[PDB]
Structure formats: structure tokens, C-alpha cells
């Protein structure tokens, strides 16, 4: 039986903030409870001179049967693992969803694909009770087959492979 304990999940060895910087298009998402980012999700990652990673995102978001284009902001606090962060986030608009989630770079090759994961709440057996995950691509037209195959493996390793939906980019925002 597969190990689905969050503590067991491998993440990106020697994660490199600088190489990860720039534009990432969300191709797929596994939603948490009370999902927020809906579609047209585009992220912009940056790293400052002190070495701190941060990001912005734009996308159609769920407010209520009410969705809207929103700009989000995230700042990442380092942990002992170079691929595991604490992400403080908020909307440019006061009323938008704000919070602090774990933010793991599960895998990336920096120039093609990235797999992100967050467990918001653990089960008592160490599995995740409430998770989300994004698959990003540098190219909004999607991953090449080699990357697609690696990503599928990573999705399976997170015990999430059956639970993603595709994210469309159709110029809405
Ligand atoms: C995984 C975060 C999304 C992409 C990284 C960019 C981070 C910078 C923008 C702030 C993120 C705010 C959105 C956090 C809610 C995610 C959960 C959800 O969409 O349902
Ligand atoms: Cl940068
Ligand atoms: Cl930090
Ligand atoms: Cl555990
Ligand atoms: Cl595969
Ligand atoms: Cl395949």
C-alpha cells in the first residue's frame, strides 16, 4: 500500500529560488475545501537581494455563485528544507481570501514544469485532511510529453493523481 503520509513526501532537492523566478502558468489544480483560485491562474515568482522569495498571481477567483478577476500576493518564509516554505498571502483587495499555507515545491526542472503542494490540515494518521496542489508550466500551451509523464508520477506520489482538474487560459483576466 502506498505511503500517503505528508511527512513521507519528497520535495525538490536543493531548490533554487532564482531559477524558479518568473512566469508560471497553472495547468492543473487539485482543490482544497472552499476552493479560491478557479482558472486563468498565472503566477509570477520573484526573489529579492536578501534571498526572499515572493509571488503575485492573477486569476478568476471564487467569491460566493460569483467569480471575479483578482490579483493576489504571496510572501514565502524559508524553513530548514529549501523546497518547503510558509506562504503568507492576501489579495490586493482587502476582502479577498488571506492566510498562511505551507507551500512545497514538490518537483520542478525550472524551465518547463513545476509541481506545488500544500497540506492545510493533517489527519491523525499523518495523511492530509485538506490539501491543494498546482501543476505549473512555463508555456501556457501545456507541458511536453516527457514533463507530463514526470508530473503524473509526482501527482501519484502525493496521493492526488485522480483529483486534479485542468486550468484553462482563455484571456478572461
Ligand atoms: C500555490 C499558490 C498559487 C500560486 C503561487 C503564487 C503565490 C502568490 C499569490 C498568492 C496565492 C493566494 C492563493 C492561495 C489560495 C490557494 C488555494 C486555492 O486556490 O483554493
Ligand atoms: Cl526575481
Ligand atoms: Cl525567509
Ligand atoms: Cl506522519
Ligand atoms: Cl508517468
Ligand atoms: Cl502518460
From Swiss-Prot:
Disulphide linkage map: 4-159, 69-173, 119-128
UniProt tissue specificity: Detected in blood plasma and in urine (at protein level).
Cellular component terms per the entry's GO annotation: extracellular exosome; extracellular region; extracellular space; protein-containing complex
Alphabetical GO biological process terms: cardiac muscle tissue development; detection of light stimulus involved in visual perception; embryonic organ morphogenesis; embryonic retina morphogenesis in camera-type eye; embryonic skeletal system development; eye development; female genitalia morphogenesis; gluconeogenesis
Single GO MF descriptor: molecular carrier activity
Compartmental location: Secreted
Modified residues (Omega-N-methylarginine): 120
Classification via PROSITE patterns: LIPOCALIN
Disease: Retinal dystrophy, iris coloboma, and comedogenic acne syndrome: A disease characterized by retinal degeneration, ocular colobomas involving both the anterior and posterior segment, impaired night vision and loss of visual acuity. Additional characteristic features include developmental abnormalities and severe acne.
Record-given protein name: Retinol-binding protein 4
Organism: Homo sapiens (Human)
Amino acid at each position: 500500500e502506498r505511503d500517503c503520509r505528508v511527512s513521507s513526501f519528497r520535495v525538490k532537492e536543493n531548490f533554487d529560488k532564482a531559477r524558479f523566478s518568473g512566469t508560471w502558468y497553472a495547468m492543473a489544480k487539485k482543490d482544497p475545501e472552499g476552493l479560491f483560485l478557479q482558472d486563468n491562474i498565472v503566477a509570477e515568482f520573484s526573489v529579492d537581494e536578501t534571498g526572499q522569495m515572493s509571488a503575485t498571481a492573477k486569476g478568476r477567483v471564487r467569491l460566493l455563485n460569483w467569480d471575479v478577476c483578482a490579483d493576489m500576493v504571496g510572501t514565502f518564509t524559508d524553513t530548514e528544507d529549501p523546497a518547503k516554505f510558509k506562504m503568507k498571502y492576501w489579495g490586493v483587495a482587502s476582502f479577498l481570501q488571506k492566510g498562511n499555507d505551507d507551500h512545497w515545491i514538490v518537483d520542478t526542472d525550472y524551465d518547463t514544469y513545476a509541481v506545488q503542494y500544500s497540506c492545510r490540515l493533517l489527519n491523525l494518521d499523518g495523511t492530509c485532511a485538506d490539501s491543494y496542489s498546482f501543476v505549473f508550466s512555463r508555456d501556457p500551451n501545456g507541458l511536453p510529453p516527457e514533463a507530463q509523464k514526470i508530473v503524473r508520477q509526482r501527482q501519484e506520489e502525493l496521493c492526488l493523481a485522480r483529483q486534479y482538474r485542468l486550468i484553462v487560459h482563455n484571456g478572461y483576466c
